[PDB]
């Protein structure tokens, strides 16, 4: 009866090893995809530092999580962040992406949640999906009128560690109120504030989702390695137990047949 359980643990060890290998490959792909998105982020965020704005601009908040939630404390950290910012301001919206944070967002005030889209992070960050999401955020949920635009996503600070972090989006109604807005020779013909706001939203949401993808894959790799070593320990212990069991039972039939004489 121990043999079948030992075989099952063997299979678990094999699954964990294969999963960590494919997680390494996916981590490489996600990192090489995310470097350019991080470049897009910085190239405009350091420029937005010049026109600080950083003003007060009921609220629209976005959350980034992966569709697959096999492991990792990603969704737990996103959940604690969203619960904290929800109790800080109960009127803020709970717009999300992916599915895992959506299922996590049932037992904590499931009415401010407005948007729900799954099937996003399973193959690659991509750009078309981000553009469509930003476009229908602007068209349907009129994001320009919401004071603070917070995006919940995990920073892949290290090759194994991660934490949620925030990137706010200045509204078109307030990017024109920047203290350094004067030094730019704007033109009223091209309606630069709103186009800048939409492009800003698209770029930062894309970079945040790419970073969350990379961090989630890294955490999955670490979890698979941990499961691998745990399965190895289980294999060792149950191999010892199986050997002892077979020796004990064979002693049992031998002593019984000896007593038969």
């Amino acid at each position: 009866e121990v043999e079948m359980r030992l075989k099952s643990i063997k299979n678990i060890e094999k699954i964990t090893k294969t999963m960590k290998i494919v997680a390494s490959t996916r981590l490489s792909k996600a990192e090489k995809a995310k470097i350019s998105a991080k470049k897009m982020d910085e190239a405009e965020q350091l420029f937005y530092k010049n026109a600080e704005t950083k003003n007060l601009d009921k609220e629209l908040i976005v959350a980034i999580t992966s569709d697959k939630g096999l492991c990792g404390s990603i969704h737990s950290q996103l959940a604690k962040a969203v619960r904290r910012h929800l109790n800080d301001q109960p009127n803020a919206d709970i717009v999300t992406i992916g599915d895992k944070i959506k299922m996590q967002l049932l037992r904590t005030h499931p009415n401010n949640i407005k948007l729900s889209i799954n099937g996003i992070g399973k193959d690659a960050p991509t750009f078309q999906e981000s553009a469509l999401i930003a476009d229908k955020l602007l068209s349907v949920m009129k994001a320009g009128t919401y004071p603070k635009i917070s995006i919940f996503y995990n920073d892949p600070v290290s090759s194994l560690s991660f934490e949620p972090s925030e990137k706010p989006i200045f509204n078109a109604k307030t990017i024109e109120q920047s203290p350094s807005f004067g030094k730019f020779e704007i033109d009223t013909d091209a309606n630069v504030p709103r186009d800048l706001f939409e492009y800003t939203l698209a770029n930062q949401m894309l970079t945040a989702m790419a970073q969350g993808y990379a961090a989630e894959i890294s955490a999955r790799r670490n979890a698979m390695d941990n499961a691998s070593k745990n399965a190895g320990d289980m294999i060792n212990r149950y191999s010892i137990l199986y050997n002892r069991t077979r020796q004990a039972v064979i002693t049992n039939e031998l002593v019984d047949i000896i007593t038969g004489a």
Binding site: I35, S36, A37, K39, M40, A43, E44, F47, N50, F127, K183, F184, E185, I186, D187, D189, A190, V192, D195, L196, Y199, N203, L206
Partner: protein, 132 residues
């Protein structure tokens, strides 16, 4: 700063990350403006056009798919792009014309879709101008 540095980047891979440039063409909503050194900080929308990167080596050209041409007072030119026109290999007349003819049929399908179709035909004609 000494000359101008261009952060021309594309989501698949960044093209330039501050490379020194002798002159930059920025076809915009109003018109192309030549920025090469110092200049004044600017914010501007990049209309689809040939953003030719003039350099001492050669004046290599790139037709942009869209973006924003913005300038910082420290002689910084942050040009965010999506899809470029590498040298002349990007040129493909037949499929461009095929898309233009096949989809101008749906250029009057549904308000937003119709407008986007007309815009894509317009940028295809821009590519045709770049096709030469």
């Amino acid at each position: 700063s000494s000359g101008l540095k261009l952060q021309f980047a594309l989501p698949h891979e960044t093209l330039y990350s501050g490379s020194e440039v002798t002159q930059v063409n920025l076809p915009a909503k109003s018109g192309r403006i030549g920025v090469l050194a110092n200049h004044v900080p600017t914010v501007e929308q990049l209309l689809p056009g040939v953003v030719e990167v003039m350099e001492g080596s050669n004046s290599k050209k790139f037709f942009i798919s869209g973006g924003f041409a913005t300038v910082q007072p420290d002689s910084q030119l942050c040009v965010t792009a999506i899809e470029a026109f590498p040298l002349e290999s990007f040129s493909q007349e037949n499929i461009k014309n095929l898309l233009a003819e096949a989809k101008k049929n749906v250029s009057s399908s549904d308000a937003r879709e119709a407008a986007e179709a007309a815009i894509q035909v317009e940028v295809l004609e821009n590519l045709q101008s770049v096709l030469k």
